[PDB]
Amino acid sequence: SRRRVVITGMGMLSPLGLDVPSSWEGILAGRSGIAPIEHMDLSAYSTRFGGSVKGFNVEEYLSAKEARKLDLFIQYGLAASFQAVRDSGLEVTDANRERIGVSMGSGIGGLTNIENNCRSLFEQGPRRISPFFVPGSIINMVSGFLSIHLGLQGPNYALTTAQTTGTHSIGMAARNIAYGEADVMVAGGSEMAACGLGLGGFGAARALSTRNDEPTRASRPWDRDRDGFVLSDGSGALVLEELEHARARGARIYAELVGFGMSGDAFHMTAPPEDGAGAARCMKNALRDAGLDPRQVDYINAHGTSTPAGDIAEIAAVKSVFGEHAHALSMSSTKSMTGHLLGAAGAVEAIFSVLALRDQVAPPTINLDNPDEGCDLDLVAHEAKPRKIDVALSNSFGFGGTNGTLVFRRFA
Amino acid sequence: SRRRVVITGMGMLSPLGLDVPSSWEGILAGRSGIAPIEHMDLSAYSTRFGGSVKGFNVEEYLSAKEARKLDLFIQYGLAASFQAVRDSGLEVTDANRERIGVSMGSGIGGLTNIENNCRSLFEQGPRRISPFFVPGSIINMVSGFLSIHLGLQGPNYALTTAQTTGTHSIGMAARNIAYGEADVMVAGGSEMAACGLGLGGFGAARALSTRNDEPTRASRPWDRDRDGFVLSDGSGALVLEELEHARARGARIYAELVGFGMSGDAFHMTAPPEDGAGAARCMKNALRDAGLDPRQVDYINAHGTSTPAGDIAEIAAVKSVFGEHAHALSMSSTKSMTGHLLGAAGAVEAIFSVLALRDQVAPPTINLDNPDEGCDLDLVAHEAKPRKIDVALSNSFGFGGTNGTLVFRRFA
Ligand SMILES: CC(C)c1ncc(Cl)c(C(N)=O)n1
Numbered sequence: 001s002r003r004r005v006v007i008t009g010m011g012m013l014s015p016l017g018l019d020v021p022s023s024w025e026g027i028l029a030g031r032s033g034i035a036p037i038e039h040m041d042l043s044a045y046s047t048r049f050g051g052s053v054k055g056f057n058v059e060e061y062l063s064a065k066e067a068r069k070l071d072l073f074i075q076y077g078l079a080a081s082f083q084a085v086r087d088s089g090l091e092v093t094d095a096n097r098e099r100i101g102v103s104m105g106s107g108i109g110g111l112t113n114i115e116n117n118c119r120s121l122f123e124q125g126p127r128r129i130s131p132f133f134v135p136g137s138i139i140n141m142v143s144g145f146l147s148i149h150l151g152l153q154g155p156n157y158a159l160t161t162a163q164t165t166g167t168h169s170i171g172m173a174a175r176n177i178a179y180g181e182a183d184v185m186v187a188g189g190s191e192m193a194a195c196g197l198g199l200g201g202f203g204a205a206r207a208l209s210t211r212n213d214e215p216t217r218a219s220r221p222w223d224r225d226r227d228g229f230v231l232s233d234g235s236g237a238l239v240l241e242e243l244e245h246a247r248a249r250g251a252r253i254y255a256e257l258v259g260f261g262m263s264g265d266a267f268h269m270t271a272p273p274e275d276g277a278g279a280a281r282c283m284k285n286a287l288r289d290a291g292l293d294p295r296q297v298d299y300i301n302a303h304g305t306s307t308p309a310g311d312i313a314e315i316a317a318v319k320s321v322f323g324e325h326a327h328a329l330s331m332s333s334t335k336s337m338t339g340h341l342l343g344a345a346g347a348v349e350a351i352f353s354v355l356a357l358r359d360q361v362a363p364p365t366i367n368l369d370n371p372d373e374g375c376d377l378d379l380v381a382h383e384a385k386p387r388k389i390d391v392a393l394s395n396s397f398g399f400g401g402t403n404g405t406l407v408f409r410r411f412a
Numbered sequence: 413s414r415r416r417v418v419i420t421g422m423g424m425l426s427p428l429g430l431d432v433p434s435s436w437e438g439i440l441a442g443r444s445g446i447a448p449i450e451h452m453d454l455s456a457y458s459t460r461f462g463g464s465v466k467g468f469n470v471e472e473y474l475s476a477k478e479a480r481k482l483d484l485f486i487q488y489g490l491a492a493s494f495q496a497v498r499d500s501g502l503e504v505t506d507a508n509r510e511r512i513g514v515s516m517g518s519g520i521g522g523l524t525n526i527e528n529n530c531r532s533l534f535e536q537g538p539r540r541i542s543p544f545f546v547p548g549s550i551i552n553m554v555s556g557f558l559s560i561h562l563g564l565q566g567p568n569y570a571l572t573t574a575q576t577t578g579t580h581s582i583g584m585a586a587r588n589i590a591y592g593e594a595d596v597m598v599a600g601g602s603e604m605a606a607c608g609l610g611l612g613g614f615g616a617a618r619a620l621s622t623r624n625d626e627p628t629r630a631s632r633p634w635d636r637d638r639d640g641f642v643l644s645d646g647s648g649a650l651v652l653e654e655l656e657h658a659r660a661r662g663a664r665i666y667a668e669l670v671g672f673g674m675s676g677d678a679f680h681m682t683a684p685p686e687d688g689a690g691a692a693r694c695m696k697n698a699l700r701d702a703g704l705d706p707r708q709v710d711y712i713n714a715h716g717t718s719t720p721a722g723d724i725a726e727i728a729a730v731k732s733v734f735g736e737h738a739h740a741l742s743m744s745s746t747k748s749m750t751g752h753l754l755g756a757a758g759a760v761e762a763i764f765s766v767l768a769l770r771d772q773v774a775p776p777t778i779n780l781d782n783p784d785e786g787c788d789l790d791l792v793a794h795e796a797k798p799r800k801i802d803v804a805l806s807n808s809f810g811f812g813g814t815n816g817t818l819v820f821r822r823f824a
């Protein structure tokens with residue numbers, strides 16, 4: 001029968017820091033991680049800024065021999081995973097290695113490496129493709145390399161559900177533990193899509209903010225002057241652990257994962273329905289999964305991408321699920337500060353939701369100068385709001401109409 | 413407890429055929445779908461052959477306009493999925509659409525689209541990248557597009573576990589149903605990596621057979637003259653359905669899905685351990701999941717890729733798990749005929765495992781002219797073997813040491 005799941009360790013790379021505490025300090029101070037991109041020339045592009053990871057030292061985590069063969073998204077995923085496992089205090093042994101698995105996902109994976117090898121192929125021929133091209137680029141190799149480095153022999157897989165990846169990865173890893181398939185899972189996501197194909201492709205879809213002259217103001221969820229999402233890089237990883245297994249080893253427990261919901265919009269390849277019907281179905285699934293009255297929800301980490309249709313669909317979904325209580329909870333988009341980490345969005349946002357619980361503070365939605373029509377909830381405009389938070393919900397919505405909701409609560 | 417899961421519908425594109433019965437007819441006749449790749453200059457490449465889908469007509473499924481937006485791997489996944497749903501007879505309604513979901517995966521995703529958009533970007537700059545590049549290339553768009561087309565509102569996700577994708581997708585979809593998160597799932601995988609990037613990428617790792625003179629003899633699992641796997645394209649989709657749901661509407665049931673096993677080798681990025689210890693844990697996990705003794709297994713659809721180390725690891729793993737029964741079961745690699753469909757391998761091989769049960773016949777391992785050292789199991793060399801099959805296993809063992817096993821049983 002279904003076991004309880006707690007969070008015992010967290011790890012992160014974000015545009016705000018090279019770990020969780022540094023990222024969280026940035027979140028609570030309303031700091032932007034968005035800046036013009038330096039790692040390539042973007043003068044031909046309609047968007048030239050993003051949330052880059054600043055000063056990432058892979059030689060804190062991996063031999064340079066290994067690092068040189070792995071896409072940045074794998075390096076970022078391993079870094080966050082290593083942080084999370086160290087943070088957990090968990091020791092891997094012959095007695096437990098079969099019971100510890102990994103589910104680290106990505107939306108796109110090793111686009112930079114694939115682009116770079118495509119350029120080699122076209123200009124120079126196939127003999128110039130890297131021998132490490134496949135294992136260094138495909139999405140499942142965060143899970144793969146983490147298992148090899150730590151000796152994890154439990155379920156080993158990867159999700160790819162676009163902007164919902166991190167939320168799905170964490171939810172389905174919790175189900176693995178709940179149902180007895182594992183006692184521990186390392187789960188989350190990683191993304192580094194900031195190459196010509198990534199910025200060019202989202203640019204071709206007119207999905208990105210073009211606020212090149214004021215990048216820190218570009219990401220403005222629910223603001224009347226929003227003009228698309230900001231592309232950001234990084235990773236989130238959590239150690240999920242069965243409750244009794246955590247208790248038995250004296251683990252520090254951050255929070256309990258009580259609820260997971262999924263749904264499909266079955267509406268449009270890229271656009272959310274205006275009424276947020278699929279998002280509402282997904283949150284209701286999650287609240288019923290957690291055995292909660294919707295009034296128990298104190299804080300929502302919104303998807304809040306700063307798109308015209310996405311931001312308003314989320315207000316419509318929260319109002320439909322929570323009714324009058326929609327005016328009592330706090331909802332914020334930390335994408336106002338971090339931008340959109342795509343496959344890693346749900347992973348860093350789950351961590352922010354757990355830290356909202358630990359610290360009893362709703363993070364701000366920065367740049368919310370002029371809330372749009374009907375965006376009249378507590379969106380924690382501009383400044384962090386200390387408040388009672390027993391239950392936190394993290395939402396993600398993705399291309400394909402794919403929705404995920406995670407429900408966390410304080411653990412006593 | 414747990415609900416029972418049955419197979420009510422199947423769909424396929426393979427190198428042997430454009431549907432299940434044509435593909436299966438090729439399998440039982442020992443036909444090869446391997447040939448030199450056409451409409452492509454592979455002069456500078458060390459491998460110039462593989463398993464192409466021949467004569468695929470996407471306009472049987474999609475309008476020309478909707479097909480132009482989607483990578484070939486997505487088109488192939490949608491063709492298999494539509495076939496599977498049609499085969500099942502299922503009627504989607506407002507009363508059941510929240511209980512019907514999708515988990516169709518891919519190993520490598522939209523390399524063809526990535527190539528063609530790289531060409532545009534490198535030659536003409538980012539403003540010539542297709543607007544549909546991102547939503548038409550990402551792995552979760554088979555699940556996305558299928559959900560939108562059929563109005564499926566159930567769990568909507570995509571796995572990417574390299575060569576294990578199709579096996580994991582089907583197994584985790586079976587869990588969704590068993591644990592009451594869905595009544596119906598469409599599950600499996602699709603792949604189209606016979607672009608330069610796939611032939612070039614696997615070729616740079618020297619993972620491919622280079623038997624260009626005789627492509628049909630290239631894929632020769634357990635034969636002493638094997639020299640790596642053969643790259644192939646296509647898709648497999650199953651309709652998985654809760655047993656009472658299937659009985660209530662009078663569904664034709666092909667077989668029961670009784671077991672799902674996962675493990676991680678935690679050994680190496682691309683090569684299995686010599687003794688196949690991970691593959692052995694995974695098969696034991698699958699049989700435990702099914703409450704079956706190894707003695708009850710009649711038929712194994714091997715991973716059987718035609719790599720020197722992979723093939724010998726699987727023999728060791730089967731001898732370890734099955735002991736005095738390892739010679740009584742029959743084990744074959746249909747990759748001897750189809751080549752290696754990577755993420756779709758596990759999907760088409762689950763369908764071949766179900767059909768082995770329906771028709772009481774072990775498909776052949778063609779090209780097994782000279783079994784290697786210690787490859788003395790019943791490998792069904794050369795020709796199909798009619799026999800008793802109550803229980804059939806399908807194994808997938810991929811990059812990152814990620815393992816999956818499905819256990820199917822006759823239903824009556
Ligand atoms: C199994 C037989 C009846 C068959 N032949 C061809 C096709 Cl394409 C299909 C299908 N499921 O769409 N089914």
Ligand SMILES: CC(C)c1ncc(Cl)c(C(N)=O)n1
Pocket residue numbers: 498499500
């Ligand atoms: C499985 C059933 C519904 C089906 N689907 C597709 C085809 Cl092609 C046929 C047929 N050949 O009459 N029958």
Ligand SMILES: CC(C)c1ncc(Cl)c(C(N)=O)n1
Pocket residue numbers: 065066069070132145148149679680681682
């Ligand atoms: C990229 C190469 C050097 C590499 N890096 C890390 C690992 Cl863990 C392995 C492996 N054991 O398969 N190989």
